[PDB]
Motif scaffolding. Structure first.
Motif, PDB file in Angstrom:
ATOM      1  N   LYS A 212       1.007  -1.181  -0.114  1.00 40.00           N
ATOM      2  CA  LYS A 212      -0.083  -0.001  -0.169  1.00 40.00           C
ATOM      3  C   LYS A 212       0.934   1.186   0.041  1.00 40.00           C
ATOM      4  O   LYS A 212       1.812   1.486   0.871  1.00 40.00           O
ATOM      5  N   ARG A 240      -1.819  -1.316  -4.030  1.00 42.11           N
ATOM      6  CA  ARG A 240      -2.848  -0.403  -3.625  1.00 42.11           C
ATOM      7  C   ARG A 240      -2.496   1.328  -3.610  1.00 42.11           C
ATOM      8  O   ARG A 240      -1.042   1.498  -2.871  1.00 42.11           O
ATOM      9  N   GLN A 268      -4.719  -3.236  -8.003  1.00 46.12           N
ATOM     10  CA  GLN A 268      -6.342  -4.097  -6.841  1.00 46.12           C
ATOM     11  C   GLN A 268      -7.123  -2.366  -6.833  1.00 46.12           C
ATOM     12  O   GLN A 268      -8.120  -2.412  -6.836  1.00 46.12           O
ATOM     13  N   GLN A 325     -15.390  -3.979  -8.668  1.00 46.87           N
ATOM     14  CA  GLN A 325     -15.771  -4.138  -7.695  1.00 46.87           C
ATOM     15  C   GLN A 325     -16.956  -3.219  -6.899  1.00 46.87           C
ATOM     16  O   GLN A 325     -17.683  -2.581  -6.895  1.00 46.87           O
ATOM     17  N   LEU A 381     -24.437  -5.451  -4.305  1.00 48.25           N
ATOM     18  CA  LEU A 381     -25.501  -5.405  -3.212  1.00 48.25           C
ATOM     19  C   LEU A 381     -24.586  -4.166  -2.009  1.00 48.25           C
ATOM     20  O   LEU A 381     -25.494  -4.384  -1.455  1.00 48.25           O
ATOM     21  N   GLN A 382     -23.400  -3.888  -2.381  1.00 47.59           N
ATOM     22  CA  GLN A 382     -23.677  -3.150  -1.427  1.00 47.59           C
ATOM     23  C   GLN A 382     -24.111  -1.179  -1.934  1.00 47.59           C
ATOM     24  O   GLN A 382     -25.049  -0.949  -3.322  1.00 47.59           O
ATOM     25  N   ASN A 383     -23.247  -0.300  -1.271  1.00 43.25           N
ATOM     26  CA  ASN A 383     -24.093   1.241  -1.159  1.00 43.25           C
ATOM     27  C   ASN A 383     -24.621   1.760  -2.661  1.00 43.25           C
ATOM     28  O   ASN A 383     -23.422   1.841  -3.476  1.00 43.25           O
ATOM     29  N   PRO A 407     -33.780  -6.369  -0.101  1.00 46.16           N
ATOM     30  CA  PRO A 407     -33.154  -6.127   1.126  1.00 46.16           C
ATOM     31  C   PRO A 407     -31.682  -5.770   1.172  1.00 46.16           C
ATOM     32  O   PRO A 407     -30.756  -5.941   1.862  1.00 46.16           O
ATOM     33  N   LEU A 409     -29.547  -4.755  -0.889  1.00 44.79           N
ATOM     34  CA  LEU A 409     -29.007  -3.486  -1.846  1.00 44.79           C
ATOM     35  C   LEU A 409     -28.764  -2.804  -0.367  1.00 44.79           C
ATOM     36  O   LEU A 409     -29.563  -1.984   0.447  1.00 44.79           O
ATOM     37  N   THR A 410     -27.799  -3.347   0.008  1.00 47.73           N
ATOM     38  CA  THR A 410     -27.182  -2.387   1.840  1.00 47.73           C
ATOM     39  C   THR A 410     -27.746  -1.425   2.057  1.00 47.73           C
ATOM     40  O   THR A 410     -29.244  -1.639   2.220  1.00 47.73           O
ATOM     41  N   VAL A 411     -27.106  -0.064   0.992  1.00 49.83           N
ATOM     42  CA  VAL A 411     -28.334   0.917   1.141  1.00 49.83           C
ATOM     43  C   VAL A 411     -27.948   2.075   0.550  1.00 49.83           C
ATOM     44  O   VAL A 411     -27.124   1.851  -0.385  1.00 49.83           O
TER      45      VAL A 411
ATOM     46  N   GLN B 135     -33.028  -7.307  10.122  1.00 47.59           N
ATOM     47  CA  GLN B 135     -31.941  -7.693   8.902  1.00 47.59           C
ATOM     48  C   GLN B 135     -30.747  -6.373   9.805  1.00 47.59           C
ATOM     49  O   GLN B 135     -29.410  -6.732   8.886  1.00 47.59           O
ATOM     50  N   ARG B 163     -28.393  -9.067   8.078  1.00 41.76           N
ATOM     51  CA  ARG B 163     -27.560  -8.133   7.221  1.00 41.76           C
ATOM     52  C   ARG B 163     -26.740  -7.354   7.522  1.00 41.76           C
ATOM     53  O   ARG B 163     -25.458  -7.470   7.252  1.00 41.76           O
ATOM     54  N   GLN B 192     -23.965  -6.858   4.574  1.00 40.56           N
ATOM     55  CA  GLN B 192     -23.677  -5.444   4.896  1.00 40.56           C
ATOM     56  C   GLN B 192     -22.478  -5.627   5.766  1.00 40.56           C
ATOM     57  O   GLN B 192     -21.907  -6.538   5.583  1.00 40.56           O
ATOM     58  N   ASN B 193     -22.820  -3.729   5.868  1.00 45.77           N
ATOM     59  CA  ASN B 193     -21.668  -3.356   6.945  1.00 45.77           C
ATOM     60  C   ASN B 193     -21.185  -4.374   8.162  1.00 45.77           C
ATOM     61  O   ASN B 193     -22.202  -4.960   9.633  1.00 45.77           O
ATOM     62  N   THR B 220     -19.951  -6.610   2.078  1.00 51.74           N
ATOM     63  CA  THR B 220     -19.673  -4.848   1.810  1.00 51.74           C
ATOM     64  C   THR B 220     -18.748  -4.394   1.876  1.00 51.74           C
ATOM     65  O   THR B 220     -18.032  -3.782   1.337  1.00 51.74           O
TER      66      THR B 220
END
Lengths: 416, 226
Positions: A212, A240, A268, A325, A381-383, A407, A409-411, B135, B163, B192-193, B220
């Motif tokens: 890194k 990194r 990466q 990713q 799947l992530q933010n 659900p 879809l993390t956030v 979740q 999650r 998730q986190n 994540t």
């Protein structure tokens, strides 16, 4: 000091043995509690516990007391602070992380006696020397000690240290001999293009296992990319590379991409953040994404890519061999006109997991396109980002609904 | 809007044609006394799903009251913001009951409380329940220690619904976290986190977590402070 065992007669034995033994235990417990309670307070601020141990120069006690200091954060203002820290750290067999807040000292051999100790520790792995006056004349001393065969420091942080190109000569010498160092943070210095030219001497050297490297805010221009590109091509360990907050404009990225696109490159994570990039170099980034299957994270925020840049990146991101990713696109000067291509990206790419769309004008109607496509088995799947981006009620409602219906879809993460 | 203010507010919340979905009562100078009325709202309301009541004095005696109705399987509560309520392990058995029975509860925020390992053990009894649908569980400054890692470790691979687990500013330890790395690799659904923010570790732990993220890309992020 008084509570010791390594003493003679002649009235040095007028103190009780039984009291000395019990008090030794009480003092040891006191250190354990305050050493572990690593917080801001008016009680012994780490170094003060060291001062106490310094007076009690008994290895049997100090080496035990020092095992309650897995992480040492101390400030150094005078010679005794160094003598005390040196003694205690040398006898500490369980310190994993050390932070040295040099104050009004450094640019001198004054601290040589401390750095020569850190290099002999078999437990110290992470050393943080950021935000202090460790100017080039001071870094030289450290670099001489970091070449010790038993150094064992794996992570070295050198943030706002006031370093310039001169220190890169000594850093190179460390990289070329120290096979333990994996993370080197040189951000927020003045290591201009020449400094990098020197640094790259070590980075390209065999036995350099650096993984890194942070060159963020190092006053760099595209001129240095010629040497960094060679490092990316040849290095077996560098994965990194963070070079944002520099003047590595489109002519700089094109140079790095020429080598980063090589399928045998180990890169990466590529931190081309506030580099002032335009859509001009997105075709270069696209080439890298299409060919370099080892690139998993790309950070482009702070640039001004616009919709043209997104279209060009999508040509690469949509490539069947692209393994990216995480793509960060915050303040990239984007408009709603890029949503069609981002919408395609969200369901066509099988590798993308995160997409940090952020502080830009993506629009309400624009984002609604994401809702419709994401529901169609997107692998994001992530933010989804969209932070600092303000929408109307209907868009927010759709996004909240999306998170409930999908659900995994993390956030999304709206600002309000 | 102290307890009386809530007593009045609940008149509208319990009223037919009240379609309120999100209600924020954070930092409203409330005590457990108001929970008697909020509990009735949760029981009867057809629309209220988001109730945020943290930064109040809704201690263990307050949560127990809300739980008495929130545990009802017909309750529409989805997010429960019992954040800085000064909760202890005493009410975690009540929260456990809710988690086990209320299949509509998807987010629970307990940071700022002082639950300790005892609280985690009690929550796990509910979280590990086959009908628990939670979740997101937030456990930041919950005064946790490494002694709770065994139960959190179990939670990570035993729960099929969890999650996100926002472990945060607490003393979970290095050896403690390493337990998560080993179990998360065993097909954990935690997509998730993982948290561990504001929590400092040694090199080996950080290395393992970075490795985990590379080997298990669907995770994540852990999100270490440095």
């Amino acid at each position: 000091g008084l509570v010791n065992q390594e003493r003679t007669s002649y009235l040095e034995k007028k103190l009780s043995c039984k009291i000395s033994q019990q008090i030794r235990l009480e003092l040891l417990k006191w250190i354990e509690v305050k050493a572990k309670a690593k917080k801001l307070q008016i009680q012994p601020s780490q170094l003060e516990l060291f001062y106490c141990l310094y007076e009690m120069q008994e290895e049997d006690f100090v080496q035990r007391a020092m095992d309650y200091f897995p992480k040492i954060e101390i400030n150094l203002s005078t010679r005794m602070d160094h003598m005390v820290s040196s003694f205690c750290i040398e006898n500490c067999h369980r310190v994993e992380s050390l932070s040295l807040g040099f104050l009004h000292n450094l640019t001198s051999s004054f601290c040589r006696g401390l750095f020569s100790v850190l290099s002999t520790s078999q437990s110290l792995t992470e050393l943080d020397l950021s935000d202090n006056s460790l100017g080039d004349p001071g870094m030289r001393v450290l670099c001489e000690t970091l070449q010790h065969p038993g150094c064992n420091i794996r992570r070295l942080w050198l943030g706002r240290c006031g370093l310039s190109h001169e220190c890169c000569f000594d850093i190179s010498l460390v990289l070329s001999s120290n096979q333990k160092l994996v993370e080197l943070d040189l951000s927020d210095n003045a290591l201009g293009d020449f400094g990098i030219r020197l640094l790259c001497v070590g980075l390209k050297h065999l036995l350099c296992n650096l993984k890194k490297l942070w060159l963020v805010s190092c006053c760099l221009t595209s001129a240095c990319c010629q040497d960094l590109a060679s490092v990316l091509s040849t290095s077996h360990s560098l994965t990194r590379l963070y070079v944002g907050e520099n003047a590595l404009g489109d002519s700089g990225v094109a140079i790095l991409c020429e080598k980063a696109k090589n399928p045998q490159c180990n890169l990466q994570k590529l931190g081309l953040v506030n580099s002032g990039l335009t859509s001009v170099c997105c075709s270069a980034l696209s080439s890298v994404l299409s060919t370099n299957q080892n690139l998993t994270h790309l950070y482009l925020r702070g640039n001004t890519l616009g919709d043209k840049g997104i279209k060009l990146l999508c040509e690469g991101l949509l490539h069947p061999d692209c393994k990216l990713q995480v793509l960060e696109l915050d303040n990239c000067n984007l408009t709603s006109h890029c949503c069609w291509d981002l919408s395609t990206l969200l369901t066509s790419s099988q590798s993308l997991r995160k997409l940090s769309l952020g502080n830009n004008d993506l629009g309400d109607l624009g984002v609604m396109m994401f809702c419709e496509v994401l529901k169609q088995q997107s692998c994001l799947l992530q933010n989804l980002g969209l932070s600092e981006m303000y929408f109307n009620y209907e868009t927010k409602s759709a996004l909240e609904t999306l998170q409930e219906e999908k659900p995994e879809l993390t956030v999304v993460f709206e600002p309000s």
